[PDB]
Enzyme design. Structure first.
Site, PDB file in Angstrom:
ATOM      1  CG  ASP A  71      -7.370   8.317   3.071  1.00 31.44           C
ATOM      2  OD1 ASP A  71      -7.797   9.315   2.455  1.00 31.44           O
ATOM      3  OD2 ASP A  71      -7.812   7.160   2.880  1.00 31.44           O
ATOM      4  CG  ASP A 121      -8.875  11.269  -0.365  1.00 30.19           C
ATOM      5  OD1 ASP A 121      -9.754  11.978  -0.888  1.00 30.19           O
ATOM      6  OD2 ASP A 121      -8.958  10.027  -0.291  1.00 30.19           O
ATOM      7  CG  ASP A 171     -11.269   8.225   3.706  1.00 32.41           C
ATOM      8  OD1 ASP A 171     -11.791   9.042   4.499  1.00 32.41           O
ATOM      9  OD2 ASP A 171     -10.886   8.554   2.561  1.00 32.41           O
ATOM     10  NE  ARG A 199     -16.069  12.847   1.529  1.00 31.82           N
ATOM     11  CZ  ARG A 199     -15.146  12.423   0.672  1.00 31.82           C
ATOM     12  NH1 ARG A 199     -14.032  11.839   1.104  1.00 31.82           N
ATOM     13  NH2 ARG A 199     -15.337  12.596  -0.625  1.00 31.82           N
TER      14      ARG A 199
HETATM   15 CA   LIG Z   1      -9.169   8.123   1.200  1.00 33.16          CA
END
Ligand SMILES: [Ca+2]
Ligand SMILES: [Ca+2]
Lengths: 487, 498
Positions: B227, B278, B282, B337
């Protein structure tokens, strides 16, 4: 007339409406560029794929084979070809896209050399030809190279599109795109003239089969074969309001594949990246009277090769050819050759250069204008925004010289002293908000640079805009999708 | 200081001067987030490369090996770290940019498994693990996978950067950048609190060694590990006025490398693209009290994973964690997302979503907000501009639900029924110029969604901007390069010479 109460007062021209008139600069010198202006209805086409594009260029005489390769009679009559949406040039005769695996399966890379995939070929190629296995004394040879050459030759015949006399390519709206290939303006056997290209986004002329040359620049380089537009045998060419870039696939995404360090050379360094691109627009050999106006060129390494060799000669190093005008362009995120000029009289005015020198950037600035062998560069009212760490930008970042006294002497035997001179002029250059004397920088780079003996006003009229708000004006008006609104 | 969000751009702070105050939302609840505000002079740094950044984070105790890997003691004292220019995180201890061949050559991919090139590893990997060869009944194992894992492990240790307690990362000017890696806010051995990140452009956390998981989604997926910011072990985090994107390596450049049909599935399809990215940010496990405000997020697939698993548990599925506020952000050209919420109490207000559903776009819109397992989503006055050539966008394109009752019941035994509810509230949502009832769409998506039983105004004060001019406001004001003016040019010693 009648203006509807719900009409849009700020709408651009209707999609599909532009014509081919308006050429400026060298393209307009002596005799006018008109492209396909006046084309008959039967030679006015809207094309949406590679087959349709080819049939328009060939006046419906083409036989397009299952691999996409072309046989037919190029049509020299005036034609207007409007580009609708995205045309992928990397597709076969059934419009099925190629992949590197397909180029291997469909060529002698498999049928002669036995390769079952491109990944297998690539692994073998690297094992055979890496510096610690092959050295740097000779060009590569053997099975993996022959297989690569098979696949590359098939791709060449697919992605290279020959453009004939009296042709306009006019993008429709804001989303006309030509991807993955190379417009070729003329061949040695069949030079062409009178071509107009407007309102198209050209992207990513990606060579799927670059060759490693162990001998290039002493340590070796990867080289690729496809420009977005090659102008080697065409005269009177107007390239206006297009966008050109490396698209989805930027060079830093394809780094060096070598990891040895030998003879003091770290082969994992960026000079050894697997370069899948070549030029944006290269003008070489007998390319002549070309104007590139109001384009957005961005995100690419070696942008414009004007003249491909230091060696003087009638075919490829001819100071009577290579007359090119660049104006109103946005040169953004280009590393070098903006422009690199050998032999030709090249005028660059009212362009906006924008990049950073930062080594970690996508396409770090390496060089701006290069006065190459017998080049004759005239630069007026260009603006440069060049960021970077450590220090302010300086004029020597923006212009330099690459001149050989020996080649000048050879030149003088074939052409005149004046024709062989390497000269540079600038006025009104702005760098990061202040004046920049590019001529002083060029003189510092090479004492061989001589006094200019031409000026473009003796060859065509033009207008010089002031530099004050030029960057903003260019950013708002240049490139594809400006002349017309969406379809 | 306090630079109002609707202030005159010409009144921006001098380059190098912004501070760490202003946290709102969940990051302001309890002990307010201040990052390194008030740091000692000896913990105030200006950094321009990966080594300098690490030494600042480690209070000059780091030993950075030739390969770039780090030993030392992350510094928990208040610190202010200003980013000058561009920092590339995918570099070794000598600041040499890594390549996949370097990672193979300098890891057990070569020293144990004998791979002489990335090309050889990749060729073997595709040959071994393609669905036609390996099937989909088990995860990958064996030599090419172990070699990939070796190379990926070295990249992980290079591109992942540990951020300790009481840290501010503050971009200088309009061109501060951090590329090609993953800020890690806390680690399992040493959780952290109190971090502020502002005025930085983050690009392209790229994994050169994605793994093929034949079992993922049953048909298989390529997955990557990095990330731009991971928040698994940090509490009280304010991420404000930054820009985040996939840089110039969009996913569109890396399509499927399979060309076969197996069990009815065309493996050349987009589901099977080689995904090198990714998340953007997050928040999982014990990440908590996080606010993302006034950022520009653009050009990326899976933007924000809030909670990484449906399985309830104190470690990774904990409804007492994952409190996150998103406000004032531009969510542009993101596929999904945005945000996907499990377990946490997540407030999204006054964000501008902008994309198209056009399948030919680089990041076509797939989903907006997802009420996941035991998530508690509260959405107010968000504007969505969602184009598409095929049909008008609908509320159902903008919110959906992913809930399982068995997991809900498992949860209640570990926590409580109220804490395990999955709830969704929205008010003031605008889609393409008209109101959109996202709650109604959520109810059709899952009948297991329950009545909301929290409101963010109980935990912090906030004022909702109206949606009328919000898209234009956010487009003009969000992201990096807004809080400060550009840096003055660096001086030349020559300028002293008369
Ligand atoms: Ca991640
Ligand atoms: Ca070329």
């Amino acid at each position: 007339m009648d203006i509807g109460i719900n009409s849009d007062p700020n709408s651009a021209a209707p999609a599909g409406s532009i014509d081919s008139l308006g050429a400026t600069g060298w393209a307009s010198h002596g005799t006018p560029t008109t492209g396909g202006q006046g084309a008959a209805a039967e030679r006015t086409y809207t094309v949406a794929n590679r087959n349709e594009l080819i049939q328009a260029l060939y006046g419906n005489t083409a036989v397009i084979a299952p691999d996409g390769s072309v046989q037919g009679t190029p049509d020299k009559a005036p034609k207007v070809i409007r580009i609708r949406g995205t045309i992928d040039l990397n597709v076969d005769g059934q419009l099925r896209p190629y992949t590197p695996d397909r180029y291997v399966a469909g060529s002698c890379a498999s049928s002669v050399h036995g390769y079952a995939s491109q990944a297998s070929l690539w692994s073998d190629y690297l094992a055979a030809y890496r510096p610690g296995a092959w050295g740097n004394a000779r060009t590569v040879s053997g099975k993996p190279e022959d297989a690569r050459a098979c696949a590359a030759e098939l791709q060449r015949r697919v992605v290279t599109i020959s453009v004939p006399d009296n042709t306009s390519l006019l993008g429709i709206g804001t989303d006309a795109k030509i991807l993955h290939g190379n417009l070729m303006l003329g061949t040695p056997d069949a030079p062409v003239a009178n071509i107009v290209i407007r309102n198209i986004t050209f992207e990513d002329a990606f060579d799927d089969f670059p060759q490693w040359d162990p001998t290039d620049s002493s340590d070796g380089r990867w080289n690729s074969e496809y420009d977005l537009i090659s102008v080697a045998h065409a005269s009177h060419v107007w390239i206006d309001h297009n966008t050109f870039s490396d698209g989805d696939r930027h060079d830093h995404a394809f780094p060096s594949v070598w990891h040895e360090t030998v003879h003091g050379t770290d082969y994992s360094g960026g000079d050894f990246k697997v370069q899948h691109h070549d030029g944006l627009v290269d003008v070489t050999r007998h390319g002549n009277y070309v104007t590139l106006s109001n384009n957005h060129f961005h995100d690419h390494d070696k942008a414009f090769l004007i003249g491909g060799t230091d060696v003087p000669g009638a075919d490829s190093g001819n100071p009577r050819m290579l007359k090119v005008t660049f104006h109103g362009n946005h040169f953004q995120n280009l590393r070098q050759r903006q422009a690199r000029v050998r032999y030709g009289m090249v005028h660059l005015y009212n362009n906006y250069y924008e990049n950073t020198r930062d080594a970690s950037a996508d396409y770090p600035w390496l060089a701006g204008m290069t006065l190459g062998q017998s080049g004759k560069v005239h630069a007026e009212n260009n603006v440069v925004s060049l960021a970077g760490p450590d220090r302010p930008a300086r004029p020597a970042d923006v212009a330099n010289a690459r001149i050989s006294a020996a080649r000048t002497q050879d030149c003088a035997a074939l052409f005149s002293a004046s024709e062989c001179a390497s000269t540079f002029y600038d006025s009104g250059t702005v760098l990061n908000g202040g004046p920049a004397d590019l001529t002083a920088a060029v003189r510092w780079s090479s004492a061989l640079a001589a006094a200019p003996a031409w000026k473009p006003s003796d060859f065509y009229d033009y207008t010089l805009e002031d530099t004050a708000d030029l960057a903003a004006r260019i950013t708002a008006r240049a490139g594809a999708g400006k002349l017309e609104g969406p379809a």
